[PDB]
Amino acid sequence: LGFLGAAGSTMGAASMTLTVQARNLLSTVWGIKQLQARVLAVERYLRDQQLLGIWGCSGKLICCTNVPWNSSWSNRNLSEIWDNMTWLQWDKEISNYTQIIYGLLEESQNQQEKNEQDLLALD
Amino acid sequence: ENLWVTVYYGVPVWKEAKTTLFCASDARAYEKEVHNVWATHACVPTDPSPQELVLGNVTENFNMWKNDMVDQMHEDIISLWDQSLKPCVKLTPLCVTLICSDAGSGGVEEMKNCSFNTTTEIRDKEKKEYALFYKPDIVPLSETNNTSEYRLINCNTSACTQACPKVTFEPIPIHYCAPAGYAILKCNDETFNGTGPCSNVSTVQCTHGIRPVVSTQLLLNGSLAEKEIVIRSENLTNNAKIIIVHLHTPVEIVCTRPNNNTRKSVRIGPGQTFYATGDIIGDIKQAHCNISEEKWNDTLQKVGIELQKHFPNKTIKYNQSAGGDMEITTHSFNCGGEFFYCNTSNLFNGTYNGTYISTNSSANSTSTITLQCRIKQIINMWQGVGRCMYAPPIAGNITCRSNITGLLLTRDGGTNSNETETFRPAGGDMRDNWRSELYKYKVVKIEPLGVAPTRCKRRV
Amino acid sequence: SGGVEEMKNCSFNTTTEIRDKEKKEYALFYKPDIVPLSETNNTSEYRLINCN
């Protein structure tokens, strides 16, 4: 499947297709407009890569972070989320809470890296 | 146990954004040595395999009136049109007073002779030359009852930049392709009313064939419908919003012209030569457009029985345009490099009261509808920033075997207890044609990042 | 009327929308923007400074 093969499919079945939607992010009168759009696409991909790498999840598609999830954010059972819902309604009802989640991931990565350098220096 | 968040990359979630788009043209448009006006040197070619993938169970809202590709297409067309008249002949030494008479013995009652003097390739020598300018391009400057002094119309306001006699106004199709990281959602619902949700959204990269035809008050060549006649409007409440009728069966329309002599070449300096209208050989006739009678009659009957759904107990009427000058009240287009401005008095003369009339006569197809009209040569289009041209004439006769696709209508303001309202045709802004050809598509941006709950524990 | 020092009238002629006909106009140009081109003791011929 090419563009958006599982944009409405099963949540548990949409985790087998993240590669094809991530493989294609880069592939005078109009000598400046396409240049600006192409540089903007490059910085969009680079911002995404740096935001992945800032919490220790670079080069790995599905990465895991040890920070917990509060009950005031979603309060919904996992089984019917992963077997009934889609991605679009999740982005509809979670996107207002994303900044504090990103801050929590950044703080957890900072704590993990500081324990790592403390363990490396103490040994 | 408890929920721990995990980050996901490569997630199919969407947002609405406004970005610039590309071009796409056929492979046959690059072998032409006439260089066209758009798709030879600027726009990129496309692959001969447009891949389209249908999505499963997604419903997406569409709003064709608040769109970004219509404005971007209009700006690209305006900029590309202004950039194609810079290395061309400028008619600045043509504002000299003209002495104009009837077109010889037995005048044609439509053109004036308009002999003048002009500067040749030598800056000192001047020579007397003649042409045959059209009547709507001739303005009588006067201080008394003088019937021999005339001048050109575009010397009064701004510029006289002639179009180059190598490019053509042929509307070849183009396709719009979204850039990297963006997609185009296209709605395949046949009962799409213009605004609202759609449940058969398909994701595509490049659009279908769009012909940027220059037309007002009536739609030329374009994409047909699928099932029935479709009404497009945003409110259908006031009388100041243009309504678009999208048809299903085409009606044949032709437009002809009598003969001319040739392009008389007149020099106004080093290299800058312009082609004016020469003589006229043979008898002179009128430039008319023919439309079939019974096809137009039952097509308007189909529009009536489909438009009666939005007005249950009201009869519909049609009449002339709601006043104005030549450029807005007449159906205007171009063919073969020559422009037409034609009266629509005999097409919108009727009414429908809800009772259908069947036309079953095989021998009645001989009767036609004729639209008599004149020809202009200086075009002031785009309602400003148009770079006022002077279209060169064509030597022989021309034909306009065309096709019709849609109609542009506008309701009139009624009175008290007015159960019979009228629908007059009107054009106006240029964005309506490209908005009618871009109802399906909507640009969309994908965000590959996401979060999800699971039981993943990263090992230390 | 008056003296109006440091300004001069400096009426000229210019082309209309017709390249053949020309019409007379007038202004009030400043003194340092006016240069006396001269081949004799003519006290009426003046030109614009930046046309040089």
Ligand SMILES: *[C@@H]1O[C@H](CO)[C@@H](O[C@@H]2O[C@H](CO)[C@@H](O[C@@H]3O[C@H](CO[C@H]4O[C@H](CO)[C@@H](O)[C@H](O)[C@@H]4O)[C@@H](O)[C@H](O[C@H]4O[C@H](CO)[C@@H](O)[C@H](O)[C@@H]4O)[C@@H]3O)[C@H](O)[C@H]2NC(C)=O)[C@H](O)[C@H]1NC(C)=O
């Ligand atoms: C809506 O759709 C219709 C049909 O698709 C379009 O009609 C076509 O319009 C184009 C131009 O607008 C026509 O092309 C012109 O045809 C002229 C006559 O063609 C006959 O003769 C030639 C030989 O001379 C044959 O090859 C041809 O098969 C026909 O038998 C030509 O004389 C024209 O040549 C001019 O252009 C070329 C290239 O620019 C120049 O090199 C020439 O010197 C000359 O200036 C031109 O090729 C086409 O014929 C029409 N189709 C039909 C079926 O008639 C409408 O234009 C389109 N749009 C609108 C608004 O209605």
Ligand SMILES: *[C@@H]1O[C@H](CO)[C@@H](O[C@@H]2O[C@H](CO)[C@@H](O)[C@H](O)[C@H]2NC(C)=O)[C@H](O)[C@H]1NC(C)=O
């Ligand atoms: C427009 O006027 C010009 C000049 O009055 C006409 O040119 C003359 O045409 C006659 C033919 O009837 C020639 O004998 C002359 O030599 C022409 N004079 C020129 C070229 O200076 C011209 O024919 C008129 N236009 C029309 C359509 O009749």
Ligand SMILES: *[C@@H]1O[C@H](CO)[C@@H](O[C@@H]2O[C@H](CO)[C@@H](O)[C@H](O)[C@H]2NC(C)=O)[C@H](O)[C@H]1NC(C)=O
């Ligand atoms: C020069 O252009 C102006 C417009 O900028 C003309 O003014 C009007 O032009 C229209 C179009 O022909 C006429 O219908 C009006 O009667 C004109 N006058 C007014 C007051 O609106 C102007 O007439 C043009 N110059 C000449 C000599 O015709």
Ligand SMILES: *[C@@H]1O[C@H](CO)[C@@H](O[C@@H]2O[C@H](CO)[C@@H](O)[C@H](O)[C@H]2NC(C)=O)[C@H](O)[C@H]1NC(C)=O
């Ligand atoms: C045209 O410009 C030149 C400058 O390139 C003028 O030359 C000098 O101008 C100053 C300013 O008035 C005078 O004081 C000098 O005497 C000029 N000559 C030299 C050799 O410096 C020139 O005068 C201008 N033309 C006219 C007619 O004034």
Ligand SMILES: *[C@@H]1O[C@H](CO)[C@@H](O)[C@H](O)[C@H]1NC(C)=O
């Ligand atoms: C779309 O969702 C409905 C809702 O359960 C489901 O029945 C259907 O199979 C889904 N479509 C696809 C292609 O999975």
Ligand SMILES: *[C@@H]1O[C@H](CO)[C@@H](O)[C@H](O)[C@H]1NC(C)=O
């Ligand atoms: C144009 O120039 C010619 C020069 O031969 C002159 O005789 C004529 O009077 C001028 N004016 C007109 C209106 O022809």
Ligand SMILES: *[C@@H]1O[C@H](CO)[C@@H](O)[C@H](O)[C@H]1NC(C)=O
């Ligand atoms: C959606 O459009 C595609 C286009 O080919 C068509 O095949 C399909 O049948 C449409 N969906 C429905 C439910 O009709």
Ligand SMILES: *[C@@H]1O[C@H](CO)[C@@H](O)[C@H](O)[C@H]1NC(C)=O
């Ligand atoms: C336009 O539509 C809105 C809501 O769809 C409505 O409130 C408004 O009255 C309409 N405009 C007119 C002039 O009726």
Ligand SMILES: *[C@@H]1O[C@H](CO)[C@@H](O)[C@H](O)[C@H]1NC(C)=O
């Ligand atoms: C159309 O407009 C004209 C304008 O005067 C009016 O007289 C006429 O009644 C209208 N309706 C029809 C059906 O002609």
Ligand SMILES: *[C@@H]1O[C@H](CO)[C@@H](O)[C@H](O)[C@H]1NC(C)=O
């Ligand atoms: C169109 O035709 C009608 C009747 O034939 C006529 O009254 C009118 O002046 C014409 N022109 C325009 C611009 O409506």
Ligand SMILES: *[C@@H]1O[C@H](CO)[C@@H](O)[C@H](O)[C@H]1NC(C)=O
């Ligand atoms: C409209 O149609 C009627 C009926 O055939 C006819 O009498 C009339 O002349 C036509 N034209 C106008 C401008 O009313």
Ligand SMILES: *[C@@H]1O[C@H](CO)[C@@H](O)[C@H](O)[C@H]1NC(C)=O
């Ligand atoms: C008009 O031109 C076409 C070809 O473009 C030709 O077939 C037709 O015969 C011409 N009309 C006349 C009256 O000769």
Ligand SMILES: *[C@@H]1O[C@H](CO)[C@@H](O)[C@H](O)[C@H]1NC(C)=O
């Ligand atoms: C218009 O209709 C004619 C005959 O009905 C057809 O040959 C022609 O291809 C149509 N035009 C377009 C652009 O499809």
Ligand SMILES: *[C@@H]1O[C@H](CO)[C@@H](O)[C@H](O)[C@H]1NC(C)=O
């Ligand atoms: C300026 O041009 C006009 C043209 O109408 C001419 O009559 C006049 O002699 C010229 N010179 C002056 C100094 O006004």
